[PDB]
Amino acid sequence: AGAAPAGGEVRRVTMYAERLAGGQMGYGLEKGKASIPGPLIELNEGDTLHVEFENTMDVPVSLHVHGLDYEISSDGTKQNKSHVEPGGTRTYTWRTHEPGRRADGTWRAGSAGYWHYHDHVVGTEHGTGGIRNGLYGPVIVRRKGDVLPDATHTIVFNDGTINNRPAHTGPNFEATVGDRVEIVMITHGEYYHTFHMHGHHWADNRTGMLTGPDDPSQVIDNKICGPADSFGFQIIAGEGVGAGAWMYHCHVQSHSDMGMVGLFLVKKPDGTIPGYDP
Amino acid sequence: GAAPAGGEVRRVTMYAERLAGGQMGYGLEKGKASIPGPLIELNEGDTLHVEFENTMDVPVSLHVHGLDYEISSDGTKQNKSHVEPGGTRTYTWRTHEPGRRADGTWRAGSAGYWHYHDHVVGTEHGTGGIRNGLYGPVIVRRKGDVLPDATHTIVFNDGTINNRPAHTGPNFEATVGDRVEIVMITHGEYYHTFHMHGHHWADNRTGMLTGPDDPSQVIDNKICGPADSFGFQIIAGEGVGAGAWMYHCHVQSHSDMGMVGLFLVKKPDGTIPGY
Amino acid sequence: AGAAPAGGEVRRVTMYAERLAGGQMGYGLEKGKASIPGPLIELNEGDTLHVEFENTMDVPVSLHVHGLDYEISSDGTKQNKSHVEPGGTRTYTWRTHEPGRRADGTWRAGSAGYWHYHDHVVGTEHGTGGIRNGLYGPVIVRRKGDVLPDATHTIVFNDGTINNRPAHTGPNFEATVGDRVEIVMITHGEYYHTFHMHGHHWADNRTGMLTGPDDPSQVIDNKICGPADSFGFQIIAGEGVGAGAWMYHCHVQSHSDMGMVGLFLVKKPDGTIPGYDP
Ligand SMILES: [Cu+2]
Ligand SMILES: [Cu+2]
Ligand SMILES: [Cu+2]
Ligand SMILES: [Cu+2]
Ligand SMILES: [Cu+2]
Ligand SMILES: [Cu+2]
Ligand SMILES: [Cu+2]
Ligand SMILES: [Cu+2]
Ligand SMILES: [Cu+2]
Ligand SMILES: [Cu+2]
Ligand SMILES: [Cu+2]
């Protein structure tokens, strides 16, 4: 229960790229704790982030980010010699800005939104191998006053997997009726997808909720997405529909049949989920 | 005509039936199933009880997008909310108006262009049921929405329009000046792009800009994937006049192989120049 | 540069459809100077354009435009005999209109937007051959008061090529830090794509810029698009990021690996590009 403050802090974090089991690779904030997706990075508009990056891996790796402000030296491409050699370290810097009126009279959009970072050098100079291996994660940049959620869950459609998981293994997320639940939805790889949530719905705009009665944004429960698309939203769990095992899945039929499905488990306050019997 | 405030409790019967050629369809009366299924129209606030009967020999279900439904009306075998052969079940859809929540945020209303479809035939995601034709449109209107003269539903289902054989339309007729509503739904395996000659719409809830402050892009071509639904109203012939106005998927092999139809816009005298 | 005036002029131009080398086909405003993409057409809402069209080729050809007001005789399809026979001429007329209140109290959208024209009869009755061969070009319709760019660049994803160019050959576009640069981005053919620009971002609305602090449009740097989609935007070159070779590419991973890539070369005021060697 709260809102994002105004930003402008200089922030620091250590990040590592590490091999994981089965040919996978992940980003982590502590050694041996790499995850797919990588760790959620949250900033308020105006914040600067210095990522003190370490490549623990035996092959080059990079960190490229969407939406945020970065100089070429933090592009994270071989083009710009801003990759990281094996065993090497590098500080990537991401800046963000508030919205404001330009001198030419136009309005400059702020950095706020649902973004993501990923590798750009593993396998190919566009990171095809590193992204396939799991080198991706979410970045939320919040505008002053944006509503904060009770929990945030990241769902990545990477080719024919969710979060590089084996088919038919979710992931599942739990909430209680009334929780404000934030979804970060990212796509990667070769395929288009359509993200669908049973029992819930959001506005197709920056925050996923209408700004008020004048917001003409479409309200949807199904959204087409392709490689490197990112969007997000906040829903009220069970709003107008109640507790239950609410499925979410890609709606491309073969993709849902092959396992691109998971559960949003919404509990009443007493913890019950009517009719859930897996 | 403009939509009123909703709030009524409404009722329909619906049946799932086998149709010719391994197809299956929904209908509001027995032996009268259609593909797409019947158009369901509600005002925000309405409740709909669908007294549903599975007349076929395989399980079927009814799952809806966008509307408010309890988990018992999800329409999946996972919840045992499917309908066994010969069975019946009442699925209930509710709808709500927009309004501010107690937490201070704005809750969107139910209004928009939605759809219902099977979730259990062939697979536990309805792949065979959707392929066979078990889909239909639902429109929920907001108080004050302008009402159209006609509503036409165009479903891109895999490589087909409305499960029709290639190059068989469908076509739709209007008169210049008619306010025509299009419901545009996609199902199956493929992405598509919907395109209309001679006409354009806003990429927002209603397909019409709300006024001069609406920044929505105006378009005549829209990418869509399985279970996407959108809709819009056009003034037939507005700024362009009468004629056989093509619509089609703009994916080139799809338009070449048959996902094309005609919006046949008539002069007042009933004729179409150039057709 | 400034702002678009109110429209309402009646304009005329010659257009030719011509064969080019390698089995290609292009539109041009001067005989012998066709190009792929075709010439940029720019109109202010309310303007009329009479295109005096000549088919110099040995196959029937047409001119079909998106978004604009055209009568059935300027549809440019075989079904109403508005194609152009080999050697023939025809006047295609495009009209446009301002937004306005209808007498019924509803709001009529204006013609403004990022549009395109292309063939509709070469090879198939949907122009599959003509489009593949290069018969496509951009149309911009501006609203009174739209900000004018310093330059406009057109990027067409046509099947697996950019602008029918051999793979890995760009195109590249040059700008100086602070330039107001306009991108028109058109897709054609068989495939879906995702368009991504490093170092830059835009608003997913008509103009690509937020109208002000009440515009809830998502700000993005990645956008899914399919055959005959058109969108555009304006960016301030290097805004918040500095000079550099800023890659743009399809983000479908194999497409970026197969050469659907180019460079937005943003130069320092001294004309140099840091970290880039030509
Ligand atoms: Cu890139
Ligand atoms: Cu998918
Ligand atoms: Cu659903
Ligand atoms: Cu990327
Ligand atoms: Cu489902
Ligand atoms: Cu298609
Ligand atoms: Cu067209
Ligand atoms: Cu569905
Ligand atoms: Cu066409
Ligand atoms: Cu591509
Ligand atoms: Cu077209």
Residue numbers in the entry:
A (entry chain A), C (entry chain B): 40 to 317
B (entry chain C): 41 to 315
Paper text:
Laccases (EC 1.10.3.2) are multi-copper oxidases that catalyze the oxidation of various organic and inorganic molecules (e.g., mono- and di-phenols, polyphenols, diamines, aminophenols, aromatic or aliphatic amines) with the reduction of molecular oxygen to water. Substrate oxidation occurs near the Cu1 ion (named T1 center), and electrons are then transferred via the Cys-His pathway to the Cu2 and Cu3α-Cu3β (TNC), where the reduction of oxygen to water takes place.
The catalytic activity of double-mutant form Met199Gly/Arg240His towards the substrates ABTS and 2.6-DMP was found to increase by 5- and 16-fold, respectively. Double-mutant Met199Gly/Arg240His exhibited the same catalytic efficiency of ABTS oxidation as Met199Gly, but activity toward 2.6-DMP increased more than 16-fold, compared to SgfSLwt. Indeed, the activity of Met199Gly/Arg240His variant toward 2.6-DMP increased more than 3-fold compared to Met199Gly. Apparently, in case of double mutant Met199Gly/Arg240His, an increase in the electron flux from the substrate (Met199Gly) was supplemented by a relevant increase of proton transfer to TNC (Arg240His). The high activity of the Met199Gly/Arg240His variant can be explained by the combined effect of the SBP geometry optimization (Met199Gly) and increased proton flux via the tunnel leading to Cu2 ion (Arg240His). There were no significant differences in sensitivity to sodium azide between SgfSLwt and mutants Met199Ala, Met199Gly, Tyr230Ala, and Met199Gly/Arg240His.
